[PDB]
Amino acid sequence: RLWMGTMAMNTRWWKVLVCLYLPVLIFPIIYFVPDEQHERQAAEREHQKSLNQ
Amino acid sequence: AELFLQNGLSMREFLSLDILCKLYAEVPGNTTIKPLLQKEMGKRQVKTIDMDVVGEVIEELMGDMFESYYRKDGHYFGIDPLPTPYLDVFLWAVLCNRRELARVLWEAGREPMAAALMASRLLKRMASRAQEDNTITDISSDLYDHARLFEERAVGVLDECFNENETLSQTLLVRELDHYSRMTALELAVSAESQDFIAHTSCQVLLTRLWMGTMAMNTRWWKVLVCLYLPVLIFPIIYFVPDEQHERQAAEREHQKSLNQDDSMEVIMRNKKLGFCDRIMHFYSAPFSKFVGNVVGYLAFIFLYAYVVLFNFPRFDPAKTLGGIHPTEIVLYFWVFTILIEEIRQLAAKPPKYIKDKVSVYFSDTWNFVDIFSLTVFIIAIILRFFTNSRIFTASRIILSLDIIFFIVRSLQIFSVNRLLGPKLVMIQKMMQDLAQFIIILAVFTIAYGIALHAVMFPSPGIYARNNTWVTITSVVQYPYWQMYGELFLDEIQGEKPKEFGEVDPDGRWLSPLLLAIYMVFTNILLLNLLIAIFNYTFERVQEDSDKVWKFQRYDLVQEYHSRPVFAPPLVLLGHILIFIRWVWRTMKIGLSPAEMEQMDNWEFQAAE
Amino acid sequence: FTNSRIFTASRIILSLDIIFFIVRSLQIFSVNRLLGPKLVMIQKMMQDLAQFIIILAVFTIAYGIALHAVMFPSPGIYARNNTWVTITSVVQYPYWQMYGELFLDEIQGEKPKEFGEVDPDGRWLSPLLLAIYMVFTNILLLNLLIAIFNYTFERV
Ligand SMILES: *[C@@H]1O[C@H](CO)[C@@H](O[C@@H]2O[C@H](CO)[C@@H](O)[C@H](O)[C@H]2NC(C)=O)[C@H](O)[C@H]1NC(C)=O
Ligand SMILES: *[C@@H]1O[C@H](CO)[C@@H](O[C@@H]2O[C@H](CO)[C@@H](O)[C@H](O)[C@H]2NC(C)=O)[C@H](O)[C@H]1NC(C)=O
Ligand SMILES: CC(C)CCC[C@@H](C)[C@H]1CC[C@H]2[C@@H]3CC=C4C[C@@H](O)CC[C@]4(C)[C@H]3CC[C@]12C
Ligand SMILES: CC(C)CCC[C@@H](C)[C@H]1CC[C@H]2[C@@H]3CC=C4C[C@@H](O)CC[C@]4(C)[C@H]3CC[C@]12C
Ligand SMILES: [Ca+2]
Known part of the structure; x- marks a missing residue:
């Protein structure tokens, strides 16, 4: 996790290699820790809902 | 729940449809099934849970065209009781990941072995679903461990069934189960990758019996080889399953005296008899006879392809008749076209019914890469052949003369039917990883020494500088x-061989052997001996597992040759047409009677107890 | 019979029978406490040697046919016009080439008189195919055979 410092856990080497020299691609294709944590929290709020109605 | 069942609760009366819908309505929230049910009923806009939703989730958790009975049976839509109360409450228990409740409901059930195999499939498939998805919480190791428990239970019931009666247990493995979408227990044990179940003696003996499809158990290869081309010898010397079973029954009737004064599975597992014309077609329909045929045809192909490549592959000239082409090469086109058709029908006959899914499962095993590569490479060579130009003709003959490697290396699959060679060929591919790591480290030392050696021998500009980029790089x-393999260029790297090797710099003449000496220590008597140590370490660990992997792959082997065309290697392409006629007109299991199905359920249940 | 051909057959047959009469000595060596068990261990290793040679033969013949086809084209100027030497x-x-006898001068351009003149495109294909063959033969299979013998030696 410290090796993946403020960056999504499944970001591959080539994606980093492309984004290192093309910093315009840095925003669209690189996911971050807030994004995945927001997704998990947004999902887990929905799982607590009742299955009917 | 266990205590209520075994005191005075009867699940036939208890479980109605509303109770079952109420059970699925009140799933916890922390489980894996809850997101899946929500995602399924999320699409198609349905506010209330029903069994159609649950059926579709169970269908997508078993991908090989599974058909849950909730989607079709009339009892699960919206009084007489439900058909299988114990089963669908057990399915609810395993989908909620409740260990003790699933065990309790498993022990009071009709088919323990099939239910256990379906459970393990469901658990490990939803485990992988939970692992690879971000909007589902990772409880994957718990689900894999629970799947492993049900795998052990399935093997245990099989083992007890085998110890009681060895023949009817093999009949138990090929039962066409009605509650599991017409799918047999062996197919369920293959769907969930259960190597311990398939490696068990009962399955292995069954696979050997299916390999000997409607043919005596001790018929040797040469006897089949003779009878394959001489079909007049098919009746006298080939024994069959009815003959040996008639002999055993006729003997066992005498032992009781006082001492004083497409129907292959049926004829395997019944008391059916074969006439004259039946036991010709049944001989040709056997997987082992198709295998022997395949081997003979394959040998013919390799000798034919080796001849054309070594001796006679001329260039195309329009002046001569036929382009000066020997008939041999046309016979080669014919056989490669036959192999192409075989690979097309191997693609077409996969379990999923989606061309992407067929292709995805077709490229699962690594042989099919080599198959499609070698076939593509061949077609490209024959396309390039006809143009009458020295450069691209040289490209054509080189491409064929290198494709011989892949067609010969492809023989190792027909060698892997052997008991001894098979496991060894699995062990080799497991050692390829250690070889790959070794070559990476070796490449680093090689390139370091290489650049230093060449720089010292041949200075960069000057008198001794070789003025050519490609030869320097190579x-x-x-x-x-x-120099690793003992080819020390001691005359060359020192002063001698000015004409052949090139003249070396005066100071390179004494640096080169010194650098060689150091390189030979760190390469030959360190790394190579370390590679020997790595292989001996991993050989024991791989020895344990590679046998099970070979045991498991015997099913695919038998199932492959069960579906191959009936006719022999020379006419095999003619045989292929009959499958096309059957397909344009528009299997390893038996259907039992209701009385027999009841008897088999009772015997299986007692074995589980 | 006094005839050069069958006399040559006679002396060759005797000069090869010496092998079997000398190898027969290993039974009189097997009365020893130490050499006896070793001679039993050898015959139990012959099975693994047999399996190894089968797999090795498949790689050998694949590489062999490819090598000879590329060096010497099938008809043409560089085609050697003799069936037996091709097969052998x-x-x-x-x-x-397994045992370190790399024919690097021969499979490349040099030695036209001894080995035979090679096709211009075979001159650069042959070392590349050799290199691949040497990886899969010397530093994979032979080391795997060492691993197989050490595994089975304890059990035997
Ligand atoms: C490679 O090219 C270089 C430069 O043209 C050659 O070096 C010259 O060789 C001549 C003849 O021996 C000398 O008189 C010069 O003094 C050299 N040049 C320098 C700058 O020192 C060299 O001969 C060529 N080498 C080969 C092998 O062709
Ligand atoms: C093998 O035989 C072939 C065919 O007879 C010979 O190839 C011919 O060689 C001559 C002389 O070099 C050329 O003029 C012809 O063009 C070649 N024929 C063709 C069809 O290209 C070859 O010389 C013989 N090789 C050996 C080593 O004896
Ligand atoms: C095995 C142990 C003793 C290490 C041996 C290292 C030897 C082989 C190395 C180290 C120094 C090297 C020598 C260094 C100097 C010379 C002088 C001249 O003739 C060129 C080669 C020659 C003769 C080298 C031959 C190889 C060499 C002798
Ligand atoms: C050990 C690792 C680095 C792999 C090395 C592979 C080397 C030995 C292989 C791969 C490509 C091959 C080269 C391909 C092309 C040429 C050009 C010419 O001179 C003929 C031989 C030569 C020089 C080959 C020599 C052997 C070669 C260099
Ligand atoms: Ca295939």
């Missing part, structure tokens, strides 16, 4: 590599 |  890689 | 060369040269 020499750096070349000479260090051959 | 396919088997021969790959086999000696």
